[PDB]
Amino acid sequence: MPLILLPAVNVVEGRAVRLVQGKAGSQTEYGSAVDAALGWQRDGAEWIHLVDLDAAFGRGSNHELLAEVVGKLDVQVELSGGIRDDESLAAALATGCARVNVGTAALENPQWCARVIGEHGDQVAVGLDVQIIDGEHRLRGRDGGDLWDVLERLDSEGCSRFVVTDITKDGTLGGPNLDLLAGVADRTDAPVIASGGVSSLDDLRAIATLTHRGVEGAIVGKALYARRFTLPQALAAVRD
Structure with missing residues (x-):
């Protein structure tokens, strides 16, 4: 049951940026x-993590492009960025993507968030951006609440999946935060997707040690562009 790799494609001005x-x-x-x-x-890749960075900052949407990517692909797309209300959620799903990620909305509009989780189940995952200040696990993104508190609320709301980033300044410096990953995975029945702190194959292998603990996958961003490893090498590193 290997770790699923989700290579990221970040979108700005209708273009990929890395x-x-x-x-x-x-x-x-x-x-x-x-x-x-x-x-x-x-x-x-069996999954692509597609992010609308313009939407993430309300600077625009790349909706038609997003749909073209989802359409042309034969594999599944997880779509993220600025998915915050009924209108933006509908638009994201209208791309035909397999599932979406909701982020800041979970901290900003908990009730809308609970409503769309109940409505869309496995089509909605929640991104948790975790800052660690003096031991405390806080949520923020773009204060935002206690991580464990919000995690429990979302778990009880039936959240199907969580995307976990450690956004602590220099917190992914020696590699990914396995404590946090395992922390979250132990406290929810929902699978956890790791995001951030990947700079090497070793980092992916490390995340892979948590699959049996509920870490379903890892989003891979700029590390794929760091001229250290290829996606095929990455995919092979986590299956064996």
């Missing part, structure tokens, strides 16, 4: 979101 490591150093590279997604699929 932080890349070239020979000379880091820079921001744009490309076609279709190209990036199809590339991952051919590399062996």
Whole structure:
């Protein structure tokens, strides 16, 4: 039952955007979101994590592009970014994506969040952005509440899935936060998707040690562009 890898495609201005490591150093590279997604699929991705960063900041939507990516893909898409109300949720689902992620809305509109969880079940996952200040696990994103408190509320509301990021300043410095991942996974019956803190295959292997504990997958972002490993290498590293 291997860890599912979800290569990320981040979308700004209708284009894919990534932080890349070239020979000379880091820079921001744009490309076609279709190209990036199809590339991952051919590399062996069964899931793409598609993020509308314009929507995430209300600076626009890339709805038609998002739909084109979902449509052209033969594999499944998890869609995220600015999914906050009835209108934006409908629009996200209208892309034909397998499921969506709700984030800040869980901290901002708990009742709407509970309503859409009940309505859409497995089509809705909640992103938990966790800051760790002096031992305390807090939620924030774009204070936002106690992590364990909000996790319990969401678990009891029937939340089907959680996406867990440690956003603590320098908290993913020595690799992914397995304590937090295992922390969340132990407190809910819902599967947990790891996001952030991945810079190597070893980081993925480490996350993979928690599959039997409820860590279903890992979103892989810029690490795929760091010229350290390929998606096929990553997929192979977690299956064996």
